[PDB]
DNA sequence: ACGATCCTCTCGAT
RNA sequence: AUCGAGAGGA
């Protein structure tokens, strides 16, 4: 719906900026994952 | 008067008699004289090699190609261990042009004639008696021309009589019975790679071009 | 199937016999002791430096990190980072000159020092092919 | 490489799959079996060189 | 058709080992080289070469395949042209190539000179050698003076 | 192994040459933490460090006399500190930690590292060796002697039976610490106070119908009635300047286990007899040479005792950089790090035991586990 | 191996002590000639003395390592025919499995101490999933 | 793979091991080598009268190998050279040189 | 000899004694990358 | 003093 | 890319 990161521990759709460095929205663990991508991927089921 | 029963101690020649060490300088003289007929009887060649040469006057300096650079970098530097040791050397060497013609003090010279000899032995070797070396950027231990030159994975043995080479390949292998004895099934992707420079010719072109 | 080779039912491979996953992760960080020299994760393009990789960048968004369902392969840049020396000298890791897969998960954290941190995982499924051991 | 035999010129037959394929009976001189042994291939660049391989 | 021989048939627990071909099949056809040596680099990881070892050489010599040894030991791999003093046998020369100029200072040689051909590793060693106070004099005629 | 480092060992290394010209005591240890720059101190969780190349390691606190920290200590996963040590099954999945994971490793910068057991020849052992043809000595009883709680001053005593079979009069001599040459035992024996030709033989030969052996010794006794007295036994090992020197060696480095204190002289004579007794049992073929490959006379050095051979080594450093902010004070200065980082390097490489390299410890003790398959 | 473990290291002295409080005439007061039937004692590679009737002594030691009052780690070796008695507390010694046999039996011969008895109480502990390995140990 | 040379081409037919007369060393040089640094004269980036260059091949893949040009893919490096002070032995030579004296004699050297 | 066991020193005593190397040895022509007096290189070719 | 060949890979540092 | 350390394939 227009997304960017996701912290790992809790599962929040964060999406933040070059310079709010890293860390969550009360679940501080600086880990953080990159979303999924949206150009939806095509599989050969073979 | 006499020949001492001589001794090697580190990098110095030391004598008994019947104790005066052999200052580096002594030995140049000598030979600087000795005979032509004296040389030769024992191994020398007037023009190509002479005992006075066997000892160090002036040391050549190997240009970059032999010892170069860079790193992880760009703006922040680079170098091999000969540029480093080819310093410890231009280093103490001026520590001594800075005593003889500046501050001059009798028995505290020789603390620093062994440096300048020593690094000049080290820049050529260090798997000998006593101390190896190391840091003054990397840690250990060291480098030396010699081990570059030395047995296996070292020049001659590893770069001259055995080089790594182009247009080669390698895979796993397996057997296949419907192949003739002198054949070898090359897999495609490799054949798509290795190449053979053919020359253009009336004879070949037609085929040849259809390739290009 | 001689001098120890063996023959495999390609049918049953298909049904899935002896299949596997294969992930591999790549890693990156930013700078060293600089009070004015700080690598930057971005998706590059010259800028006086012009030594960027043979391969393609267009698979990286702007943080400079491929997105997950994205299929990479070839010499494809997975992580763009540039190091400014005097300026924008490329310095970004491309996928193995031989591997090909799909990004699986991408992680962004940091190290003791407040450092920008990245670990990209790529996944491939490898199938019992001819030369494989067993 | 402990013989002349661990080296020998061959006739190329490009094929699919990625394994150097060879004839059982040219095994010994190489001393290979097929449970993973790997093998090198080099390619001559001169017309002479080609000759040196196919003739000697 | 039935098979003449009865066969051993059964479930048997098997293992899939790491080591699959597609991760091995490196092949090079001329690529990058090291800085020092100018020889191809180690590893498929960077499109290296394969080592044509001291040992494989023995076999080429075994076969009597000279020319191929040069090709393999020179044209693929190191190969480099160097000039030399036609007197004081040395890599003391000076390619002011262009300005058809040659000189070997001191020696002052301007007409006795040589373009020759060797493994760049060769030149190296020689320079290494020289830099260790030794002469590797390179002479041109099968001839010793007498 | 680990627990019994921490739990006990550690605390004993810190008490020792520890004291100053200041007195540590209870060391205190944290379940692993982490101080991210600009920030609180987090609670460290294995899965978390494996991800951001942090070091699952805990806080080192010492209780320093006239409460205080000196470094951090890489923690053995599933050991008494590792929070995983009390964890329930569902508690695990929760910390995202496999419950089949058995732990036994460290985590240093995201890389799981394993300490590789190390095999070595035991000490404080009595060993006899027939030595080759071409050598004058013909057997030698030996002992790689050294202390179980306290240092690693390594002191090797040899009792060689100079003299092949027949080769004229088989004399017996021994070897000593920082010393010039060998010694005919009888001196030494005189030197420990045992003087009478034969109050000696008792210390060696234990039953007197063994003429054979006795006789074996007939010729030692003779290399010494050139010395029949305590003070000139001590003599031969170079006045008063150098007597001392010996009344030392024969307490401080001659058979160190047993003791190094004052009057434990006969406690050793006897031993030295014992050595000689087997040295001779072995030369008269009543009994076999000593088999260097008995697993029983070798030990394995696990992770505890290794961290251990490092911790001393740095704790002695933090300890003595300190005899130094302090030497230059005349009028807290502790470089924690030394330690919290020395530990990391060894655990991080394989050069078991700091900088110099030397420590061809080289084991690459500390490798990166393997994890291709559970069973690996 | 599966059942192998490794010495971690105890303290020598509480034993040394026990020893010198049960015969083990110490070394200094030693008179080889007037007591040869002397199993000499050894701890951690040290000679702490001698001992007449070392027999009546081992049993005791074994019962004390096996009741649990002396660490189960410590190895206790009595070599009969060379008259020595070595007690080991070193750290880094491998060691292992096994069960016990003492002929300890009434209606008949040399047996294993263990029994379907204990073993059945051991499984007792499989389906309630207080009888641990360790209780076997003590 | 490098240019035309006017020079001709010969094959190697003789190799003369031998030694170094300071004579040639300074006859053969271009070097002087007066300072022990590599390149920074107050952050100034280039080379220097000191080490690695005063007439010697380069780095910034640039041609200034003394009117020599062609650079680092044809610059047979050309030699440096450096006067010492009060002379010095030469390691793999110590032991012949010890043997040379246990062979000649003092003061006149015969 | 270089091409084998004690390499640096054979190079030195060679340096000092001023050895003159023939270069008729396989081993040395491989070093200068030239033809070998071997099968294919033992005769010469002409017109 | 030497010590199988070749081979792919992972970790860590002035 | 140089260097040292272990792991693995024949
Ligand atoms: Mg096989
Ligand atoms: Zn959260
Ligand atoms: Zn010249
Ligand atoms: Zn040039
Ligand atoms: Zn004379």
Q: How far is the CA of F49 from the C1' of K10 (A)?
A: 38
- β-pairing, B168-175 vs E27-28, is antiparallel
Show the tokens assigned to E102. Answer: 């040659």
Closest ligand (CA of B35): 5
State the Cα–Cα distance between residues A9 and C94, nearest whole angstrom: 29
- For E104, what's the count of Cα atoms within 13 Å in the CB-facing half-sphere? 19
Closest ligand (CA of C3): 1
The count of other CB atoms within 10 Å of the CB of residue G7 is: 21
For C17, phi then psi, to 5°, come to -50, 135
State the Cα–Cα distance between residues F249 and F275, nearest whole angstrom: 18
Q: Which of C4, C58, C62, C113 is catalytic?
A: C4
Show the tokens assigned to D56. Answer: 């000697």
State the Cα–Cα distance between residues F341 and F70, nearest whole angstrom: 11
Question: Alpha-carbon dihedral of residues I34, I37, I39, I40, nearest 10 degrees?
Answer: 40
Q: Which residues, including other chains, have CB under 8 Å from residue H2's CB and lie 6 or more apart?
A: E80, E81, H70, H73, H74
Q: Which residues, including other chains, have CB under 8 Å from residue B131's CB and lie 6 or more apart?
A: none
Q: At what angle do helices F266-281 and F211-224 cross, to 10 degrees?
A: 120
Q: How big is the CA angle at E120 (ends E119 and E121), to the nearest 5 degrees?
A: 85
The count of other CB atoms within 10 Å of the CB of residue F335 is: 15
Residue position matching structure tokens 């053919």: B198
User: Using an 8 Å Cβ cutoff, are F166 and F275 in contact?
Assistant: no
CA–centroid distance, residue B46 to ligand 3 (Å): 18
Count the residues in chain E. Answer: 146
Distance from CA of B204 to the nearest CA of D (A): 15
State the Cα–Cα distance between residues E93 and F193, nearest whole angstrom: 82
State the Cα–Cα distance between residues E94 and E106, nearest whole angstrom: 12
User: Distance of CA E75 to CAs E68, E78, E79, F153, Å?
Assistant: 10, 7, 6, 61
Statement to judge: residues F217 and F158 lie in one domain: yes
Residue position matching structure tokens 């062979």: H103
CA E139 and chain centroid, separation: 22
Statement to judge: residues F267 and F156 lie in one domain: yes
G9, G19, G29, G34: which is closest to G92 by C-alpha? Answer: G9
Show the tokens assigned to C21. Answer: 């996953």
F345 touches strand J (CB under 7 A): yes
State the Cα–Cα distance between residues H15 and F35, nearest whole angstrom: 67
State the Cα–Cα distance between residues B61 and H51, nearest whole angstrom: 9
Domain range list for chain A: 1-46
State the Cα–Cα distance between residues H82 and F259, nearest whole angstrom: 61
Q: Three-state SS for B38?
A: helix
The count of other CB atoms within 10 Å of the CB of residue F178 is: 10
E56, E24, E52, E23: which is closest to E40 by C-alpha? Answer: E52
B72 touches strand K (CB under 7 A): yes
User: Distance of CA F241 to CAs A46, F245, F248, F250, Å?
Assistant: 92, 7, 12, 16
State the Cα–Cα distance between residues E113 and H26, nearest whole angstrom: 21
Q: How big is the CA angle at I24 (ends I18 and I28), to the nearest 5 degrees?
A: 70
CA F370 and chain centroid, separation: 30
User: Using an 8 Å Cβ cutoff, are D5 and C118 in contact?
Assistant: no
State the Cα–Cα distance between residues C67 and C78, nearest whole angstrom: 9
Q: Which residues, including other chains, have CB under 8 Å from residue C111's CB and lie 6 or more apart?
A: C29, C117, F52, F53, F54
Residue position matching structure tokens 């923690």: F75
CA E63 and chain centroid, separation: 20
F48, A41, A42: which is closest to C68 by C-alpha? Answer: A41
State the Cα–Cα distance between residues F364 and F354, nearest whole angstrom: 12
User: Distance of CA C5 to CAs C131, D32, F27, F42, Å?
Assistant: 9, 12, 61, 55
Count the residues in chain A. Answer: 46
Q: Which residues, including other chains, have CB under 8 Å from residue B132's CB and lie 6 or more apart?
A: B126, B141, B142
Q: Specify the DSSP class assigned to residue G97.
A: -
Statement to judge: residues F145 and F284 lie in one domain: yes
Helix, strand, coil share (%) of chain E residues, nearest 5: 25, 20, 55
CA–centroid distance, residue H25 to ligand 3 (Å): 11
State the Cα–Cα distance between residues B175 and B138, nearest whole angstrom: 50
Show the tokens assigned to B46. Answer: 């007037």
User: Would you list the DSSP string of H34-99?
Assistant: -SS-SS-BTTB-S--SSSS-TT---SSS---STT--S-TTT-----EEEEEEEEE--GGGHHHHHH
Q: Three-state SS for B91?
A: helix
Q: Three-state SS for F27?
A: strand
Show the tokens assigned to G58. Answer: 């081992």
State the Cα–Cα distance between residues H12 and I32, nearest whole angstrom: 7
Residues near ion ligand 1 (Cβ under 5 Å)? D 33, 35
Q: How big is the CA angle at E121 (ends E117 and E124), to the nearest 5 degrees?
A: 95
User: Using an 8 Å Cβ cutoff, are H88 and B26 in contact?
Assistant: no
For F109, name the nearest residue in chain C, comparing CA atoms only.
Answer: C111
Q: Do chains G and F touch (3 or more CB pairs under 8 A)?
A: yes
F157, F135, F196, F176: which is closest to F274 by C-alpha? Answer: F157
Q: Three-state SS for D30?
A: coil
Q: Which residues, including other chains, have CB under 8 Å from residue C107's CB and lie 6 or more apart?
A: A8, A31, A32, A33, A34, C117, C118, C119, C120, C121, F51
Give the burial class of F73: count Cβ atoms within 10 A of its Cβ; 0-12 exposed, 13-18 middle, 19 or more buried.
Answer: buried
D15, D18, E16, A45: which is closest to C128 by C-alpha? Answer: E16
G84, G90, G111, G117: which is closest to G99 by C-alpha? Answer: G111
- β-pairing, C20-28 vs F173-175, is unpaired
F172, F150, F154: which is closest to F283 by C-alpha? Answer: F172
Interchain contact, F267 vs G27, CB within 8 Å: yes
Q: Specify the DSSP class assigned to residue F9.
A: I
Residues of chain C in Cβ contact (below 8 Å) with chain F: 107, 109-114, 117, 119
For I10, phi then psi, to 5°, come to -65, -30
Which residues share a beta bridge with D38? B172
Prior bond of F133 cis (ω within 30°): no
The count of other CB atoms within 10 Å of the CB of residue F12 is: 13
Show the tokens assigned to G65. Answer: 């390592």
State the Cα–Cα distance between residues C106 and A36, nearest whole angstrom: 9
Breaks in chain C follow which residues, C to N over 2.5 Å?
A: 86
Show the tokens assigned to B74. Answer: 């760009």
Breaks in chain B follow which residues, C to N over 2.5 Å?
A: 18
CA–centroid distance, residue E81 to ligand 3 (Å): 16
Helix, strand, coil share (%) of chain F residues, nearest 5: 35, 20, 50
Question: What is the span of the domain harbouring residue C122?
Answer: 20-127
Residue C104 annotated in active site:
no
B72 touches strand J (CB under 7 A): yes
- β-pairing, F137-145 vs F126-130, is antiparallel
Please list the alpha-helical segments (H only) found in chain D.
47-55
User: Using an 8 Å Cβ cutoff, are G65 and G43 in contact?
Assistant: no
For F8, phi then psi, to 5°, come to -115, -80
User: Using an 8 Å Cβ cutoff, are E123 and B159 in contact?
Assistant: no
State the Cα–Cα distance between residues H86 and H93, nearest whole angstrom: 18
Which residues share a beta bridge with G49? G26, G41
Residue position matching structure tokens 């012009």: C50
User: Using an 8 Å Cβ cutoff, are A33 and A8 in contact?
Assistant: yes
Q: Which residues, including other chains, have CB under 8 Å from residue B144's CB and lie 6 or more apart?
A: B81, B85, B122, B123, B124, B125, B126
State the Cα–Cα distance between residues I33 and C9, nearest whole angstrom: 51
User: Using an 8 Å Cβ cutoff, are H48 and B80 in contact?
Assistant: no
Q: How big is the CA angle at C118 (ends C115 and C124), to the nearest 5 degrees?
A: 170
User: Distance of CA D34 to CAs C19, D29, E21, F19, G62, Å?
Assistant: 22, 14, 12, 67, 58
State the Cα–Cα distance between residues B159 and B63, nearest whole angstrom: 20
Q: Chain I within 8 Å of E70 (Cβ-Cβ)?
A: yes
Question: Alpha-carbon dihedral of residues A15, A21, A26, A30, nearest 10 degrees?
Answer: 100
B to C CB pairs, distance under 8 Å: 15
B30, B37, B70, B20: which is closest to B53 by C-alpha? Answer: B30
**Quick one: which residue's CA is nearest to K6's C1'?**
F364
F113 touches strand J (CB under 7 A): no
In the 149-168 segment of chain B, residues within 7 Å (Cβ) of strand J are 151-152, 162, 164
Question: Alpha-carbon dihedral of residues F99, F103, F106, F111, nearest 10 degrees?
Answer: -60
Closest ligand (CA of E103): 3
Interchain contact, B164 vs E30, CB within 8 Å: no
For F129, phi then psi, to 5°, come to -135, 115
State the Cα–Cα distance between residues G83 and G94, nearest whole angstrom: 25
Identify nearest nucleotide to residue B80 by CA to C1′ distance.
K2
User: Using an 8 Å Cβ cutoff, are C60 and A27 in contact?
Assistant: no
State the Cα–Cα distance between residues F2 and G8, nearest whole angstrom: 9
The continuous run of DSSP H or E covering F45 comes out as none
Show the tokens assigned to F133. Answer: 């043809």
User: Would you list the DSSP string of E81-127?
Assistant: EEEEESSS-SS----BTTTTB---SSS--SSSEEEEEE-HHHHHHHH
Which residues share a beta bridge with F33? F43
Q: How far is the CA of F348 from the C1' of K4 (A)?
A: 13
State the Cα–Cα distance between residues C25 and B197, nearest whole angstrom: 40
What CATH number is given to the structural domain containing C105?
2.40.50.150
Q: Which residues, including other chains, have CB under 8 Å from residue C45's CB and lie 6 or more apart?
A: C52, C57
Please list the alpha-helical segments (H only) found in chain B.
28-33, 36-41, 81-100, 115-122, 146-149, 155, 188-191, 205-211
B141 touches strand J (CB under 7 A): no
User: Would you list the DSSP string of F317-357?
Assistant: HHHHHHSSTTTTT------THHHHHHHHHHHHSS-SS-TT-
Distance from CA of C83 to the nearest CA of B (A): 9
State the Cα–Cα distance between residues F255 and G46, nearest whole angstrom: 10
What is the layout of strands, in order, in the sheet containing C88-90? C40-41, C81-84, C88-90
CA B204 and chain centroid, separation: 50
A30, A6, C34: which is closest to F38 by C-alpha? Answer: A30
Residue position matching structure tokens 């020949």: B3
C58, C44, C68: which is closest to A39 by C-alpha? Answer: C68
User: Using an 8 Å Cβ cutoff, are F301 and G92 in contact?
Assistant: yes
State the Cα–Cα distance between residues H56 and B67, nearest whole angstrom: 13
Q: How big is the CA angle at E85 (ends E81 and E86), to the nearest 5 degrees?
A: 105
Q: Chain B within 8 Å of D45 (Cβ-Cβ)?
A: yes
State the Cα–Cα distance between residues B17 and F245, nearest whole angstrom: 36
- Please name the chains neighbouring I, where neighbouring means 3+ C-beta pairs under 8 angstroms: B, D, E, H
Q: Three-state SS for E28?
A: strand
Question: What is the span of the domain harbouring residue F151?
Answer: 124-291
State the Cα–Cα distance between residues B56 and H20, nearest whole angstrom: 9
Give I9's contacts in chain H (Cβ within 8 Å): 92
Q: Three-state SS for G118?
A: helix
Q: Which residues, including other chains, have CB under 8 Å from residue F27's CB and lie 6 or more apart?
A: F10, F11, F14, F60, F61, F62, F63
F93, C90, I27, F226: which is closest to B160 by C-alpha? Answer: I27
Q: How big is the CA angle at B127 (ends B123 and B130), to the nearest 5 degrees?
A: 100
B197, B195, B172: which is closest to B185 by C-alpha? Answer: B172
The continuous run of DSSP H or E covering F14 comes out as helix F11-14
Show the tokens assigned to F66. Answer: 């006239």
In the 71-100 segment of chain E, residues within 7 Å (Cβ) of strand J are none
State the Cα–Cα distance between residues F80 and F61, nearest whole angstrom: 17
First to last CA, chain I: 37
The count of other CB atoms within 10 Å of the CB of residue B20 is: 9
Has H107 been labeled as part of a binding site? no
Which positions 271-330 of F are in contact with B (Cβ < 8 Å)? none
Which architecture characterizes domain A1-46 according to CATH? Single Sheet (2.20)
F367 touches strand J (CB under 7 A): no
Give the residue from H84, H93, H97 with the most B CB atoms within 10 Å of its CB, the best one to mutate.
H84
Q: Chain B within 8 Å of F355 (Cβ-Cβ)?
A: yes
State the Cα–Cα distance between residues B170 and E28, nearest whole angstrom: 9
Q: Which residues, including other chains, have CB under 8 Å from residue D53's CB and lie 6 or more apart?
A: D9, D44, E65, E68
Has H101 been labeled as part of a binding site? no
How would you write F253-287 as a 3-class SS string?
A: CCCCCCCCCCCCCHHHHHHHHHHHHHHHHCCCCCC
- For B62, what's the count of Cα atoms within 13 Å in the CB-facing half-sphere? 29
Distance from CA of I46 to the nearest CA of B (A): 24
This PDB structure is determined at a resolution in Å of: 3.6
């Amino acid at each position: 719906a227009t997304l960017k990161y996701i912290c790992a521990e809790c599962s929040s759709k964060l999406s933040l900026s070059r310079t709010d460095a890293v860390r969550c929205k009360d679940c501080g663990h600086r880990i953080l994952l990159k979303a999924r991508t949206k150009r939806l991927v095509q599989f050969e089921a073979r | 008067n006499t020949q001492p029963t001589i001794r090697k101690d580190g990098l110095k020649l030391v004598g008994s008699w019947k104790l005066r060490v052999l200052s580096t300088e002594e030995i140049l003289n000598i030979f600087k004289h000795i005979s032509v007929k004296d040389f030769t009887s024992l191994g020398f060649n007037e023009v190509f090699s002479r005992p006075e040469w066997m000892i160090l006057t002036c040391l050549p300096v190997p240009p970059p190609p032999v010892r170069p650079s860079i790193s992880f970098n760009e703006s922040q530097r680079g170098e091999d261990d000969l540029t480093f040791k080819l310093a410890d050397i231009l280093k103490a060497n001026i520590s001594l042009e800075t005593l003889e013609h500046n501050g001059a003090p009798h028995h505290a010279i020789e603390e620093a004639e062994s440096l300048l000899q020593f690094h000049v032995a080290t820049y050529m070797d260090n798997d000998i008696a006593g101390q190896p070396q190391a840091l003054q950027k990397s840690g250990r231990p060291v480098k030396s021309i010699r081990a570059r030159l030395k047995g296996k994975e070292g020049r001659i043995r590893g770069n001259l009589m055995g080089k790594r080479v182009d247009f080669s390949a390698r895979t796993v292998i397996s057997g296949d019975p419907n192949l003739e004895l002198d054949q070898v099934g090359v897999p495609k992707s490799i054949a798509k790679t290795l190449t053979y420079p053919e020359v253009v010719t009336p004879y070949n072109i037609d085929r040849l071009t259809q390739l290009v | 199937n001689q001098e120890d080779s063996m023959i495999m039912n390609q049918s049953s491979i298909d049904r899935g016999l002896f299949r596997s996953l294969f992930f591999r992760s790549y890693m990156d960080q930013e700078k060293k002791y600089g009070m004015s020299i700080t690598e930057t994760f971005e998706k590059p393009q010259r800028t006086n430096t012009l030594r960027m990789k043979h391969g393609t960048y267009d698979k990286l968004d702007d943080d400079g990190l491929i997105a997950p369902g994205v299929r990479v392969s070839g010499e494809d840049v997975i992580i763009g980072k540039t190091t400014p020396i005097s300026s924008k000298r490329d310095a970004s890791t491309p996928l193995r000159s031989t591997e090909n897969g799909i990004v699986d998960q991408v992680l962004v954290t940091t190290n003791q020092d407040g450092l920008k941190f990245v670990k990209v995982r790529v996944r491939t499924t490898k199938i019992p092919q001819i030369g494989d051991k067993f | 490489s402990l013989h002349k035999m661990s080296m020998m010129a061959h006739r190329v037959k490009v094929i699919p799959y990625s394994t150097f394929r060879l004839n059982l009976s040219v095994t010994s001189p190489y001393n290979a079996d097929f449970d993973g042994d790997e093998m090198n291939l080099h390619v001559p660049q001169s017309e002479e060189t080609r000759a040196e391989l196919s003739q000697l | 058709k039935k098979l003449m021989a009865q066969i051993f048939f059964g479930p048997t627990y098997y293992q899939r080992l790491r080591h699959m071909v597609d991760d091995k099949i490196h092949a090079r056809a001329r690529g990058p080289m090291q800085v020092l040596t100018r020889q191809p680099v180690e590893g498929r990881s960077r499109d290296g070469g394969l080592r044509f070892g001291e040992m494989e050489r023995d076999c080429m010599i075994a076969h009597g395949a000279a020319s191929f040894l040069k090709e393999r030991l020179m044209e693929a791999s190191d190969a480099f042209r160097v000039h030399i003093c036609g007197i004081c046998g040395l890599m003391t020369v000076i390619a002011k190539l262009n300005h058809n100029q040659f000189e070997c200072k001191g020696c002052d040689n301007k007409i006795d000179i040589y373009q020759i051909h060797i493994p760049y590793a060769a030149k190296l060693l020689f320079q290494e050698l020289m830099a260790m106070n030794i002469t590797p004099r390179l002479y041109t005629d099968r001839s010793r003076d007498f | 192994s680990f627990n019994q480092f921490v739990d006990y060992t550690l605390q004993d290394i810190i008490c020792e040459d520890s004291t100053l010209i200041i007195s540590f005591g209870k060391i205190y240890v944290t379940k692993p933490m982490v101080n991210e720059s600009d920030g609180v101190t987090h609670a460290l969780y294995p899965q978390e460090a494996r991800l951001r190349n942090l070091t699952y390691s805990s806080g080192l606190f010492v209780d320093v006399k006239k409460k205080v920290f000196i470094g951090r200590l890489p923690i053995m996963l599933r050991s008494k500190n590792c929070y995983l040590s009390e964890a329930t099954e569902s508690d695990l999945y929760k910390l995202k930690e496999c419950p089949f994971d058995m732990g036994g490793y460290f985590i240093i910068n995201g890389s799981e590292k394993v300490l590789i057991a190390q095999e070595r020849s035991a000490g404080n052992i009595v060993q006899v060796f027939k030595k080759a043809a071409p050598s004058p000595i013909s057997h030698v009883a030996e002992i790689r002697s050294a202390l179980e709680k306290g240092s690693r001053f390594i002191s090797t005593l040899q009792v060689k039976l100079y003299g092949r079979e027949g080769s004229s009069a088989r004399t017996i001599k021994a070897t000593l610490p920082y010393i010039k040459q060998d010694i005919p035992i009888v001196i030494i024996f005189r030197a420990l106070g045992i003087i009478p030709d034969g109050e000696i033989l008792e210390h060696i030969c234990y039953d007197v119908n063994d003429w054979q052996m006795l006789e074996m010794l007939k010729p030692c006794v003779e290399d010494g009635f050139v010395i029949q007295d305590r003070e000139t036994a001590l003599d031969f090992i170079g006045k008063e300047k150098r007597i001392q020197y010996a009344k030392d060696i024969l307490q401080k480095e001659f058979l160190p286990h047993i003791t190094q204190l004052e009057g434990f002289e006969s406690r050793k004579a006897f031993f030295l007899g014992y050595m000689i007794n087997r040295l001779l049992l072995c030369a008269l073929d009543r009994k076999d040479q000593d088999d260097r490959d008995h697993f029983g006379k070798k030990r394995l050095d696990l992770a505890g005792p290794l961290l251990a051979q490092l911790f001393k080594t740095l704790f002695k450093k933090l300890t003595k950089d300190i005899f130094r902010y302090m030497q230059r004070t005349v009028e807290l200065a502790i470089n924690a790090k030394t330690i919290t980082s020395g530990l990391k390097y060894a655990l991080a490489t394989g050069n078991w035991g700091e900088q110099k390299k030397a420590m061809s410890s080289r084991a690459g003790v500390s490798q990166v586990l393997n994890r291709y398959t559970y069973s690996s | 191996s599966l059942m192998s473990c490794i010495s971690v290291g105890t303290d020598p002295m509480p034993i040394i002590t026990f020893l010198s409080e049960w015969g083990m005439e110490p070394l200094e007061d030693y008179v080889p000639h007037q007591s040869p039937d002397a199993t000499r004692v050894f701890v951690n590679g040290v000679w702490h003395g001698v001992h007449r009737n070392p027999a009546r002594l081992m049993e005791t030691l074994r019962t004390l390592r096996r009741k649990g009052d002396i660490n189960p780690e410590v190895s206790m070796i009595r070599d009969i025919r060379e008259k020595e008695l070595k007690i080991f507390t070193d750290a880094g010694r491998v060691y292992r499995p096994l069960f016990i046999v003492e002929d300890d039996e009434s209606l008949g011969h040399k047996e294993l101490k263990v029994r379907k008895g204990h073993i059945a109480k051991l499984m007792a502990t499989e389906y309630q999933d207080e009888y641990t390995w360790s209780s076997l140990l003590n | 793979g490098q240019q035309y040379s006017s020079a001709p081409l010969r094959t190697v037919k003789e190799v003369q091991f031998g030694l170094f007369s300071p004579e040639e060393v300074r006859a053969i040089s271009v070097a002087k080598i007066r300072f022990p640094e590599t390149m920074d004269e107050t952050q100034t980036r280039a080379k220097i009268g000191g080490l690695n260059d005063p007439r010697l091949g380069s780095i910034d893949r640039n041609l200034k190998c003394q009117t020599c040009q062609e650079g680092m893919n044809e610059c047979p490096g050309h030699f440096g050279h450096i006067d010492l002070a009060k002379p010095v032995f030469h390691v793999g030579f110590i032991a012949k040189i010890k043997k040379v004296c246990e062979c000649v004699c003092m003061h006149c050297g015969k | 000899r270089c091409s084998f066991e004690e390499t640096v020193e054979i190079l030195f005593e060679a340096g000092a004694s001023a050895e003159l190397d023939d270069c008729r040895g396989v081993s040395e022509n491989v070093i200068l990358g030239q033809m070998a007096p071997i099968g294919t290189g033992a005769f010469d070719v002409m017109i």
